[PDB]
């Protein structure tokens, strides 16, 4: 209602965007730590399985 005292969507949307940025940061940090894109089975199942067997 532009003056509500119980809720505000601006904080919710700011939180959502911050969480998205944190997730991307986590992915990049994992890449830097392990030194490779496909490190686990979550990154890419097909390529990870192929690399293990090879």
């Amino acid at each position: 209602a532009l003056n509500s005292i119980n809720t505000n969507a601006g904080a919710m949307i700011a939180l959502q965007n911050l969480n998205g940025t944190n997730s991307e940061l986590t992915t990049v940090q994992q890449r830097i730590n392990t030194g490779k894109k496909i490190a686990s089975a979550k990154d890419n199942g097909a390529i990870w399985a192929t690399a293990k067997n090879q």
């Binding site: 089975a41 979550k42 199942g45 990870w48 293990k52």
Partner: protein
């Protein structure tokens, strides 16, 4: 607003599912490494020009690695339930405020799950020749199961974000 509170209840089930699958994935990575080592040992033991003393050493290494695999597989439990021991066939978590479920099938990665049949060794230089192929098949099927588990984990994360 009652429904929104119910969704607040759903998110906890999704988080618990995340934790369980993460434990299973860690155990699976260890098991795949051990399976690679076992394949190498079995290949080395199939050489026909070895002494009686090297064959026994390679056999002991193989036995040690197999026992390691069993120990690693049996301990991947979170909250008493597991998707890697073979105790249950599937786990269902909450997905919707109306009671709908998110189903995760069980991917047994124990010795019996991958066909290795605990207390399985080679006694001659010809049994290791077939153990090579057996371990190749075991590694292939283990990697397939772990890829499926990874897909399930990604699905859980995505649905948790959408519910929030």
């Amino acid at each position: 607003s009652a429904t929104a509170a119910s969704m607040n209840a759903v998110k906890d089930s999704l988080q618990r599912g995340q934790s369980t699958i993460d434990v299973a994935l860690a155990a699976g990575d260890t098991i795949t490494d051990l399976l690679g080592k076992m394949k190498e040992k079995a290949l080395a033991a199939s050489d026909c020009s070895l002494n009686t003393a090297s064959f026994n050493a390679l056999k002991s290494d193989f036995d040690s690695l197999r026992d390691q695999i069993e120990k690693a597989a049996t301990s991947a439990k979170f909250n008493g339930v597991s998707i890697a021991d073979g105790s249950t066939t599937k786990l269902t978590f909450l997905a919707n405020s109306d009671g709908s479920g998110f189903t995760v099938n069980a991917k047994t990665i124990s010795l019996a799950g991958i066909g290795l049949t605990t207390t399985s060794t080679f006694t001659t230089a010809a049994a290791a020749k077939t153990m090579i192929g057996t371990i190749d098949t075991a590694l292939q099927t283990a990697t397939n199961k772990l890829a499926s588990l990874g897909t399930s984990s990604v699905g859980l994360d995505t649905h948790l974000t959408f519910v929030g």
